[PDB]
Amino acid sequence: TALVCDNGSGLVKAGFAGDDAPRAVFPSIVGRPRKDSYVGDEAQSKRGILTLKYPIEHGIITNWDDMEKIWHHTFYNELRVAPEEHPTLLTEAPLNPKANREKMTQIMFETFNVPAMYVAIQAVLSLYASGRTTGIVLDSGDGVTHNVPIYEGYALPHAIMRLDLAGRDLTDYLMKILTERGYSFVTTAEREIVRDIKEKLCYVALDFENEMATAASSSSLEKSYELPDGQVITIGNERFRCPETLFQPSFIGMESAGIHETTYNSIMKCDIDIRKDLYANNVMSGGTTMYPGIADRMQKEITALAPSTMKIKIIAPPERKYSVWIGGSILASLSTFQQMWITKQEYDEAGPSIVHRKCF
Amino acid sequence: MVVEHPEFLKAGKEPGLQIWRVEKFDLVPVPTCLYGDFFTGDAYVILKTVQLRNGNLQYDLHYWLGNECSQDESGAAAIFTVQLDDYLNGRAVQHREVQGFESATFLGYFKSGLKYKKGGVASGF
Ligand SMILES: Nc1ncnc2c1ncn2[C@@H]1O[C@H](COP(=O)(O)OP(=O)(O)OP(=O)(O)O)[C@@H](O)[C@H]1O
Ligand SMILES: [Ca+2]
Ligand SMILES: [Ca+2]
Ligand SMILES: [Ca+2]
């Protein structure tokens, strides 16, 4: 039976083709002595005696030796499968470097002995999962944000935009402003608490200015949050100030334009004859797209940027933290997908270069 | 690439209307007597083949999604469409059709008017 592994900068999403969700979700981390290693939660718990490392930086695999650990743990610790028994589908970032794709192919065949494998682009899979073959995807996780326009099933490499501002950066920001309010959040253990507050109490404002003013008046935006230690804190304009950074990167001292602009900009880099399709098929994907209010603000933000008669539409599915993984589970499950896999036979004949001709 | 599926071998061989339904992750032909009767719990792939005067064949692919179809069905219809296009040397133009919002062209494939019926085949998840 086919497996699907979706390897993110922050979390690994793993499971079996045909399932409607990933069976295993865990932090993409490898701990070593300051067994000879731990992965995921185990690593985090014994963090005090370990050196922690993230093998994927901004969606790109950057430490091969640590990645094999992740994969091993995935196969043996989480999925409890014998890798040599299952054809395996992996995901990658758009614009993933040539030799990285080759490396992944080599390790699977040479170290794990899979009978077959395949690499697909994360954003494209999201589009598939929403039942579309044409649209532009906004994919934002813990390490990277991209805009990926897609036509009739295939990304358009020239028009893709990458932005190194995402979830981790939002968590760090909420930390700073929250201690600014009088509280104190500096420690890793504290980073963890803020992340939970980031995911529970934050939201995106429809009008950021009014929101600020309305928070300076009454206290109807204010919310209470009980610390692990029992203390209660009161969270204010930070609820909506933290994700504001997605639209105004200047907040964190970034020079890039917000995600509404990078969206408009990717679209305009495409052939004029497809722009309308793009504009009407804006798919949101990944964890950092989960803030309440996010789809309304973007809907507002891009009708302002585009001609007043453009039909515009944002699609933000409740399950979009898993849309990539679900896209893969569907693709690998189809009757017609049989001949798509790269066989061990093909690899032995051609070598790792085969990936460039078998996987777009 | 290169697909071996027997329906793939049959698609676009001659002018006409071919209709397949997505059935638990497979492409299954619809009985020709049932054309136009769509289960609103299911998803379908339609191929419309018209004769060109240059002797070559023109193609239009449309995937139709019912209001109550499951995610695996809507996702698979879309992928099958991409695959059918590629197999046809990318010669097809692709169209997305949503229940209650179909295009005038697609609606015209059905001379006696298309019809909606509740139900469908169960999910493949
Ligand atoms: N409800 C939520 N609201 C806001 N942020 C959330 C929510 N749930 C998860 N996140 C954030 O989403 C991130 C995890 O998302 P995701 O699993 O898509 O990323 P990833 O695949 O590991 O990273 P990347 O795609 O950037 O390489 C974390 O930064 C996390 O705080
Ligand atoms: Ca990701
Ligand atoms: Ca159905
Ligand atoms: Ca085509």
Output the 3-class SS for B39-69.
ECCCEEEEEEEEECCCCCEEEEEEEEECCCC
CATH architecture for the domain at A30-53:
Roll (2.30)
- Using CA atoms, how far residue A185 sits from A170, A173, A233, A270, A292, in Å, is 14, 11, 12, 44, 24
Q: What is the DSSP string of A239-267?
A: HHHHHHTTT-GGGGT--S--HHHHHHHHH
The technique is X-ray
CB A39 within 8 A of CB A63: no
Going by C-beta distance under 8 Å and a sequence separation of 6 or more, which residues neighbour residue A189?
A: none
Q: Which residues on chain B are in Cβ contact (under 8 Å) with A135?
A: none
d(CA A44, CA A31): 8
CB A11 within 8 A of CB A122: no
Query: Does the C-beta of A352 come closer than 6 Å to ligand 1?
Result: no
CA of A285 to the centre of ligand 1 (A): 10
Give which of A108, A158, A165 is closest to A142, Cα–Cα. A165
CB A237 within 8 A of CB A212: yes
Report H helices in A46-187: 64-72, 98-106, 122-129, 167-180
Q: List residues bridging with A17 in a β-sheet.
A: A19
Domain count, chain B: 1
Q: Which residue has the tokens 């798919």?
A: A283
Same fold for the pair A1-29+56-119+322-358 and A30-53:
no
Report helix, strand or coil for B34.
helix
Give the residue, by CA position, lying nearest to ligand 1 atom 25. Answer: A141
d(CA A320, CA A254): 26
Query: Does the C-beta of A323 come closer than 6 Å to ligand 1?
Result: no
Beta-sheet pairing, A38-39 with A30-33: antiparallel
Beta-sheet pairing, A88-92 with A116-121: parallel
**Could you count the other beta carbons within 10 Å of the beta carbon of residue B25?**
23
CB A156 within 8 A of CB A149: yes
CA of B49 to the centre of ligand 4 (A): 14
- Residue-wise over A126-157: b if at least 16 C-beta within 10 A, else e? bbbbbbbbbbbbbbbbbbbbbbbbbbbbebbe
Give which of A92, A118, A17 is closest to A327, Cα–Cα. A17
CB A274 within 8 A of CB A286: no
Going by C-beta distance under 8 Å and a sequence separation of 6 or more, which residues neighbour residue A78?
A: A14, A23, A24, A26
CB–CB of A333 and B27 under 8 A?
A: no
Ligand 1 atom nearest to A144, measured from its CA:
26
Instruction: Give the domain range for residue B112.
Output: 1-125
Q: Indicate the class that CATH gives domain A121-166+256-317.
A: alpha beta
Interface test with A, best of B71, B86, B99 (most A CBs within 10 A): B71
DSSP one-letter code for B92: P
A220 token code pair:
């109807």
For chain A, domain boundaries: 1-29+56-119+322-358, 30-53, 121-166+256-317, 167-252
Going by C-beta distance under 8 Å and a sequence separation of 6 or more, which residues neighbour residue B43?
A: A131, B21, B22, B63, B64, B65, B66, B69, B73, B74, B76, B77
Give which of A172, A129, A159, A330 is closest to B124, Cα–Cα. A330
d(CA A13, CA A78): 11
Beta-sheet pairing, A282-285 with A135-140: parallel
Which strands make up the sheet holding A30-33, listed edge to edge?
A: A38-39, A30-33, A50-53
Q: What is the CATH number of the domain that holds B96?
A: 3.40.20.10
Report H helices in A181-293: 188-201, 208-216, 238-244, 259-268, 275-279
**Could you count the other beta carbons within 10 Å of the beta carbon of residue B49?**
18
d(CA B98, CA B10): 26
Instruction: Please give the CATH superfamily to which domain A167-252 belongs.
Output: ATPase, substrate binding domain, subdomain 4 (3.90.640.10)
Q: List residues bridging with B59 in a β-sheet.
A: B49
A19 token code pair:
């399932």
d(CA A119, CA A7): 11
- Domain A1-29+56-119+322-358: assigned CATH number: 3.30.420.40
